[PDB]
Amino acid sequence: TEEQIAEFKEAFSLFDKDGDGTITTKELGTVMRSLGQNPTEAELQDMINEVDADGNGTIDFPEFLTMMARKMKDTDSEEEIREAFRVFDKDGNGYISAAELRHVMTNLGEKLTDEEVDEMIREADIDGDGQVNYEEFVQMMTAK
């Protein structure tokens, strides 16, 4: 994984922008401020807390490597996403409406771009009484 570890080291160098070796809240916030995201202090706090496991308050290079190495496609993660989709299942028949899903994504939580939600809708077979099998979405977003 020499290519992968080299990419991870380059990414860490871009993140910290210095030779300190520890990722602080200020630098992580600036990384996205360069893109005009305006991160919150609590947002950066949970960003740092999710990589490190010792509670030092900074993201060390081995911790970031451990975070990146693990694969998103996991049984626990797949079940969590499946139940997240089932949250909006009607009659327990495993069907979620396309338009209802669009409205839910647009209004609740971090609003998705209209075009992006449209691609979500088109990424699978949306016809068939207006319902889309959420498990197809789970399979599409669990393939890594």
């Binding site: 969590e80 997240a84 949250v87 028949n93 495993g94 994504m105 939580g109 099998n133 599409m140």
Partner: protein
């Protein structure tokens, strides 16, 4: 179109078979009625009188269940592609090893053998058939999903273990004592309280409110003691049913309340949003950084959802209350300090 339609029919049949809801319950009730009628017919065939008509009517059910169950097994195997993990020969074989599926096929071949041996009519064969008839009960058994009934009963029993145990112990004591006293009071006058085993049988049946009537106290002192201990021990022996029933009702109430105020909405929305963001992001370095951030957001939402798995209780409400209180406290103390600095 056609293959997508085929996929659809298979999904629908998979839900009606394995994940019933609504009409699927009506089909499962039909199958349950068929199995229960088979059991009733077998029991009736046990009776020498009705063994003639019952045998013929039951034979029909053999084939009826046979044909119906073979068709259902064929549909289940052909279906189960809803997840697509069982498609293809290897996937169908993987599905066929499901404990309930292997049980179903075993019951199927047992029914086939019963019909074939009824055709042949051997002595040992027919005895084996009188014995193999109960297997259709595995169809009644497969009915439940992963033994949900057993798990629920065990959960409620374990939660109330101390009360069931306390109650049962006290009741046992009551029984032993009452049996003994009546026995002393009636060991000679009554010929049915001859031994303490007889008195224990009378007490068991008496306190359990069965009251066969084979043994009943005759002496009036015996009847008085029986009445008093009947009131006590009857309360104690009926206790476990009340404890378990009340526990079931309370657990149902709790589950309903938790369902009404479940916390799935916001974590789910955030999770799906960031998951799609990462799927889309999967200058170049800026896009890669955004992809990493979106994957991290997906993982955080997954962690929050796993946390929300825990059913809501007084803990969660009081936790959020205290959190809000501490935020307002710190913020308003900061405002007071700031206004003070302004005064300075």
């Amino acid at each position: 179109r056609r293959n997508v339609k085929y996929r659809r029919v298979q999904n629908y049949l998979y839900n009606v078979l394995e994940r019933p809801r609504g009409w699927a319950f009506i089909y499962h009730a039909f199958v349950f009625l068929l199995v229960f009628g088979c059991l009733i017919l077998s029991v009736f065939s046990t009776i020498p009188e009705h063994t003639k008509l019952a045998s013929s009517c039951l034979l029909i059910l053999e084939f009826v269940m046979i044909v119906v169950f073979g068709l259902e097994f064929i549909i289940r195997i052909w279906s189960a592609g809803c997840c697509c993990r069982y498609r293809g020969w290897q996937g169908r074989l993987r599905f066929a090893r499901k404990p309930f599926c292997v049980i179903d096929t075993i019951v199927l071949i047992a029914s086939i053998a019963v019909v074939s041996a009824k055709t042949q009519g051997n002595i040992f064969a027919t005895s084996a058939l009188r014995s193999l008839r109960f297997l259709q009960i595995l169809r009644m058994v497969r009915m439940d999903r992963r033994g949900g009934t057993w798990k629920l009963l065990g959960s409620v029993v374990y939660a109330h273990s101390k009360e069931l145990i306390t109650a049962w112990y006290i009741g046992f004591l009551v029984l032993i004592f009452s049996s003994f006293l009546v026995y002393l009071v009636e060991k000679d006058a009554n010929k049915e309280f001859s031994t303490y085993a007889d008195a224990l049988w009378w007490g068991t049946i008496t306190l359990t409110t069965i009251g066969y009537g084979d043994k009943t106290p005759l002496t009036w002192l015996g009847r008085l003691l029986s009445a008093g201990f009947a009131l006590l021990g009857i309360s104690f022996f009926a206790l476990p049913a009340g404890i378990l029933g009340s526990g079931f009702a309370l657990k149902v109430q709790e589950q309903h309340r938790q369902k009404h105020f479940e916390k799935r909405r916001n974590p789910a929305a955030n999770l799906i949003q960031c998951v799609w963001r990462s799927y889309a992001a999967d200058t170049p370095p800026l896009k890669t950084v955004i992809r990493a951030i979106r994957i991290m957001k997906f993982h955080v939402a997954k962690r929050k959802f796993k946390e929300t798995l825990r059913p809501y209780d007084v803990k969660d409400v009081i936790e959020q209350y205290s959190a809000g209180h501490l935020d307002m406290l710190c913020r308003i103390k900061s405002l007071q300090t700031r206004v003070d600095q302004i005064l300075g």
